[PDB]
């Protein structure tokens, strides 16, 4: 059964609730982004009407196969009547295709539903700024204090200097980058466009960066794993067994790799600079965690909902324990209280 914080009080919508069957009373079902825990339960058997952004119909069609005709995408930053109620779809700083969802209900109320967000101060500069917000469904994924984690910008200059320096010292090596959904595509295009390679990889993954409307993109990747020195694989792949098969699928072009693993958080993250990160080494394997994350950091939360001022907070990540939801609620409350709403 859906829950509470899945809901839109006074309309016929839901958001990200697939996979509860037919919800009693929903008239569209909102998509914000082609992530799995988001669209789980969309088939080619979903007859229900799917509104969501251009990139998210391309992965809905082409990748799981829903009918055309459920597929209602929507331009950003325009306000649209849905079933007799202004919406409008923002950028979300996500991966490709995700978006915020801002409801104009006919009582008058004005509800933002982040999805799964990035907070940037660009967004005090949308539509949002506009009018007055009274409730906030919000991804709290990172809302605590000790989450703090660099710049998007900071990890891929250290990821383009790491991988030019070693591959200019061996023009042998072989970067391989590991992915397990769409999103963070800037590691391996960054890295790709400084060695001058394209990024090979499955045809299955091809396909699916086909549909994400990325200009010129036939320009930088490719299916043909001989021409290419930047290889994509299956994140769970990467590891030293996993990358030493690799490697002799390789019939001897390569003698060493250098391996990313873009993560969210990791605890390393508390002590340590971006500057100062060390890999993982077997013999001539070496594999980095670099801290590229797609969500707010505890401090962008903050300032983006301090900006906001919404007279009530609904998370949506970590609800599942009292003392998450516990603490999640303290610190609403701080900053309430500091910057006086
Ligand atoms: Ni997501």
């Known amino acids: ?31 914000t982004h082609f992530h799995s825990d988001h669209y789980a339960g969309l088939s080619k058997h979903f007859t ?25 995408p929507l331009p950003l930053d325009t306000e649209c009547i849905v079933n007799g109620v202004k919406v ?20 008058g109320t004005v509800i933002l539903h982040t999805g799964d967000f990035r907070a940037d101060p660009s967004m005090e500069r949308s539509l949002l700024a506009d009018q007055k917000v009274h409730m906030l469904y919000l991804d709290t994924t990172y ?5 703090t984690f660099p710049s998007q910008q900071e990890v891929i200059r250290f990821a383009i200097n790491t991988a030019f320096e ?35 990889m ?14 010129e993109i036939n320009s930088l ?31 001897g072009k390569y003698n060493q790799i250098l391996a990313f693993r873009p993560t969210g958080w990791t605890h390393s ?10 890999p993982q080494t077997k013999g001539n394997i070496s594999i980095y965690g670099i801290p590229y994350s797609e969500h707010s950091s505890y401090l962008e939360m903050k300032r983006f909902v301090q900006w906001l001022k919404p007279q009530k907070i609904i998370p949506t990540v970590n609800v599942g324990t009292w003392k998450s939801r516990s603490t999640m609620e303290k610190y609403f409350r701080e900053w309430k209280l500091e910057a006086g709403y």
């Open 1 to 31: 059964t859906c829950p509470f914080y899945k809901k839109i009080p006074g309309t016929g919508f839901t958001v990200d609730a697939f996979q509860y069957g037919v919800v009693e009373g929903c008239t569209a079902y909102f998509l």
């Open 143 to 147: 809302c605590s204090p000790e989450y």
């Open 88 to 107: 409008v779809l923002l950028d979300a700083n996500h991966c490709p295709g995700a978006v915020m969802i801002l409801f104009y209900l006919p009582n």
């Open 166 to 200: 070693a591959v200019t010292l061996n023009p042998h090596a072989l970067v391989v980058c590991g992915t397990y959904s769409i999103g963070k595509e800037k590691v391996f295009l960054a890295i790709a466009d400084v060695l001058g390679s394209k990024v090979g």
């Open 48 to 72: 229900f009407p799917v509104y969501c952004s251009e990139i998210t119909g391309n992965l809905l069609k082409n990748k799981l196969h829903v009918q055309e005709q459920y597929i209602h």
């Open 202 to 215: 499955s045809q299955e993954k091809y396909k699916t960066l086909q549909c994400l409307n990325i200009p």
């Open 221 to 251: 990747i490719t299916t043909d794993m001989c021409s290419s020195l930047v290889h994509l694989l299956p994140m769970m792949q990467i590891n030293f067994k996993g990358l030493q098969s690799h490697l002799k699928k390789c019939g």
């Open 269 to 278: 993250n508390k002590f340590t600079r971006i500057a100062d990160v060390i």
